[PDB]
Amino acid sequence: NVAACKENFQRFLQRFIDPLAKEEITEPLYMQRLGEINVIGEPFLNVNCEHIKSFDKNLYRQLISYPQEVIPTFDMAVNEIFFDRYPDSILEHQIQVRPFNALKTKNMRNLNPEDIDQLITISGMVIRTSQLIPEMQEAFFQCQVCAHTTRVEMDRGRIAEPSVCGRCHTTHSMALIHNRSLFSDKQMIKLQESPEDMPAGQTPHTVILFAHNDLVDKVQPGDRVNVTGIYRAVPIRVNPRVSNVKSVYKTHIDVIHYRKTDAKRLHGLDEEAEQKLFSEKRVELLKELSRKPDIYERLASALAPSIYEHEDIKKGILLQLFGGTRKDFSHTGRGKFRAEINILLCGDPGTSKSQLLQYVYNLVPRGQYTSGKGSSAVGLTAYVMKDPETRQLVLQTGALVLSDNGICCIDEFDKMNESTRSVLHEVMEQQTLSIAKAGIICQLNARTSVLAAANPIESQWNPKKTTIENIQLPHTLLSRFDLIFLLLDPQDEAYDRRLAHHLVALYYQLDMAVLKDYIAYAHSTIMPRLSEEASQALIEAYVDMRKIGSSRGMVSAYPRQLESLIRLAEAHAKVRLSNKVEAIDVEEAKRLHREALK
């Protein structure tokens, strides 16, 4: 069973060819993988245990049925085909093998006891993790008489005491020395089945996974993964004293491989090292698309290809996905400087606000969606809970802190009593949060960016009143926003006709990976610095704003707006990869700031 399988696996690893494409025939597929493993670190080999289903079918029966008596063979049979690069580079740990599956195999509700201890794949949404837990591997005993130190191994899954000192023979003198033994790591994680793929009218389950030595911190709460690993069940004891174990076992999953393919979202900020992992064939594409005279309007108009025109709101929500530069003000003692853009959408009903939030929330990774009455003051920022076991008050994070890199869509912004609305004043302007409660005195921080939607008071935009009276928000809160979009839309007989003609079409029947990669690039390798010709159009653009907004009674302008222009101007330069702010990048993001309140 052991020798008969490495011989059959090496063949696979050597002679395999696929009708597929990788990294955008080079026959030695897994030998090329094994070469890459040698040119860099990271001694793991991600094998797809379906390729081994084409090449063979009598190991693919024994890999998903005796996985713990096979995967060691799959390590050994890779160490030897590493002969090509043995002398060249000599790493230390070992080479590894990690079967997986592109597509899931089961749910969390159809795990049956004919599947105990055999490879299994599920999918879910990690809820919470834990801190590391040691786990002994090699004991280390020592006698009190002979003071002789033997080192017994854990082979089957338990540690046996020798009870005879190889020198003095006192028949029990061998204590166990803890901190001289060898330990390994172990983490406990909880999945939660996705809303899709669950029965009619039911509540999500959870499943406990156990990570191990190297996978120990490779996932975060809030991630959607495709875990692959063995499925085990261990007994439990009714007393922690007697050996009377129960008869109903308890199951978990010894994870073996993760996979976070989130193509429905963009790129999270764990892949900044992975931006250097772009095909140079692609950087040409991006740099060339960034030269067309209107790449702004060509990318913007590709957001949410179901909303009708609304041309400006998509401009704003596109500049929000880039944000101003991240300058480093630690020297001037000023503190830090917000670089993300907060957008407010106000306008009479039916104008498709909540659809834009529902679209963004499903686009950006690390986001949240909240509402008006179903969210409290402390549930948005940070609460203090009586931890159940230890009976102690411990801190937790709300919604505005769980996002932290992304967008916190807050629908129904009007219908939040003024208490829970005055909480956003801190987290949305300084990017911080200062907590001082019973035993907890700390100061969090986050890099969120609100995107709120409200209705006018009376829910009807009556043009008799003044703009600062249909909104009915204070000034110490309207100034923390910098793009207040008034969707003033009546019954334009032409607009209604065009919209209906568009909506009906959805009943008969640019790319993403351009945008999904353009964004990662424009985040990784761009930092627009102002100029002197741009800086000289930014001063007057604020001295006129005052005289304008003073009289009309619409919305006054405080010096904070002069920073927003910066935030907007720079954010425009990033769209075209210009790496330097010039004049036009101020006129554009000034016309945008002016022609939104009209």
What residue 165 binds from Zn ion, another protein, none (CB within 5 to 8 A, per partner kind)? Zn ion
Identity of the residue numbered 73: T
Q: Tokens 């402390």 label which residue?
A: 378
Which two tokens mark 143? 């006698």
Q: Kindly report the backbone phi and psi dihedral angles of residue 174, in degrees, each rounded to the nearest multiple of 5, phi listed first.
A: -90, 95
CB-nearer residue toward another protein: 291 or 334: 334
Contact 90/212 with Cβ under 8 angstroms?
A: no
What residue 153 binds from Zn ion, another protein, none (CB within 5 to 8 A, per partner kind)? none
Spatial distance between the Cα atoms of 486 and 464, rounded to a whole number of angstroms: 16
258 is in an annotated binding site: no
Q: How far is the CB of 149 from Zn ion (least distance, A)?
A: 10
H-helix or E-strand spanning residue 125 = strand 124-125
CB-nearer residue toward another protein: 146 or 286: 146
Q: How far is the CB of 167 from Zn ion (least distance, A)?
A: 6
| Sign of the dihedral defined by the CA atoms of residues 112, 117, 123, 128, in that order | positive
Q: Site residues (CB under 8 A) for another protein?
A: 131-136, 144-149, 167-168, 175, 178-180, 183-185, 216-217, 220, 222, 240, 269, 332-335, 366, 395-397, 401-405, 441-443, 445-447, 475-476, 479, 556, 558-560
Q: Site residues (CB under 5 A) for Zn ion?
A: 143, 145-146, 165, 168, 173
CB-nearer residue toward another protein: 424 or 573: 424
CB-nearer residue toward another protein: 301 or 432: 432
CB-nearer residue toward Zn ion: 172 or 327: 172
Q: How far is the CB of 168 from Zn ion (least distance, A)?
A: 4
Q: How far is the CB of 148 from Zn ion (least distance, A)?
A: 6
What residue 305 binds from another protein, Zn ion, none (CB within 5 to 8 A, per partner kind)? none
What residue 335 binds from Zn ion, another protein, none (CB within 5 to 8 A, per partner kind)? another protein
What residue 133 binds from Zn ion, another protein, none (CB within 5 to 8 A, per partner kind)? another protein
CB-nearer residue toward another protein: 58 or 131: 131
CB-nearer residue toward Zn ion: 139 or 428: 139
The 3-state secondary structure of 277-330 reads CCCHHHHHHHHHHCCCCCCHHHHHCCCCCCCCCCHHHHHHHHHCCCCCCCCCCC
What residue 404 binds from another protein, Zn ion, none (CB within 5 to 8 A, per partner kind)? another protein
3-state secondary structure of 395: strand
Strand segments, DSSP code E, in 387-491 are 393-395, 408-410, 432-436, 441-445, 450-454, 483-486
Identity of the residue numbered 111: L
Spatial distance between the Cα atoms of 296 and 576, rounded to a whole number of angstroms: 8
- Could you tell me where the DSSP H helices lie in 80-171? none
Residue 346 Cα distances to 219, 450, 487, 554, angstroms: 38, 14, 6, 14
Helix count and strand count (H, E) for the chain: 21, 20
Q: Are strands 124-125 and 224-225 parallel, antiparallel or unpaired?
A: antiparallel
CB-nearer residue toward another protein: 120 or 321: 321
What residue 446 binds from Zn ion, another protein, none (CB within 5 to 8 A, per partner kind)? another protein
Q: How far is the CB of 176 from Zn ion (least distance, A)?
A: 14
Q: How far is the CB of 205 from another protein (least distance, A)?
A: 24
Which two tokens mark 425? 């004043």
Nearest residue to the partner Zn ion, using Cβ: 165
Q: How far is the CB of 131 from another protein (least distance, A)?
A: 6
Contact 70/63 with Cβ under 8 angstroms?
A: yes
CB-nearer residue toward another protein: 109 or 475: 475
> Could you tell me which of 297, 322, 291 has the C-alpha nearest to residue 568?
322
Q: How far is the CB of 340 from another protein (least distance, A)?
A: 13
353 is in an annotated binding site: yes
CB-nearer residue toward Zn ion: 143 or 424: 143
What residue 286 binds from another protein, Zn ion, none (CB within 5 to 8 A, per partner kind)? none
Spatial distance between the Cα atoms of 67 and 173, rounded to a whole number of angstroms: 39
What residue 447 binds from Zn ion, another protein, none (CB within 5 to 8 A, per partner kind)? another protein
Torsion of CA 137, 143, 147, 151, to 10 degrees: -20
Contact 347/353 with Cβ under 8 angstroms?
A: yes
What residue 202 binds from Zn ion, another protein, none (CB within 5 to 8 A, per partner kind)? none
CB-nearer residue toward Zn ion: 171 or 491: 171
- DSSP for residue 220: -
334 is in an annotated binding site: yes
Which two tokens mark 364? 């950006």
CB-nearer residue toward another protein: 318 or 483: 483
Report, in this order, helix, strand and coil percent for the chain, each rounded to 5: 30, 15, 55
61 is in an annotated binding site: no
Q: How far is the CB of 178 from another protein (least distance, A)?
A: 6
563 is in an annotated binding site: yes
Helices 515-524 and 280-289, axial angle in degrees (round to 10): 90
Contact 275/524 with Cβ under 8 angstroms?
A: yes
Spatial distance between the Cα atoms of 592 and 289, rounded to a whole number of angstroms: 23
Contact 68/99 with Cβ under 8 angstroms?
A: no
128 is in an annotated binding site: no
Other Cβ atoms within 10 Å of 166 Cβ, number: 11
Q: How far is the CB of 410 from another protein (least distance, A)?
A: 18
Identity of the residue numbered 515: L
Spatial distance between the Cα atoms of 44 and 362, rounded to a whole number of angstroms: 33
> Could you tell me which of 75, 116, 154 has the C-alpha nearest to residue 250?
116
What residue 220 binds from another protein, Zn ion, none (CB within 5 to 8 A, per partner kind)? another protein
Q: How far is the CB of 100 from Zn ion (least distance, A)?
A: 49
Identity of the residue numbered 565: L
Q: How far is the CB of 256 from another protein (least distance, A)?
A: 20
* Residues in binding site: 308, 334, 353-354, 455, 480, 560, 563
- Known binding-site residue numbers for ATP: 308, 334, 353-354, 455, 480, 560, 563
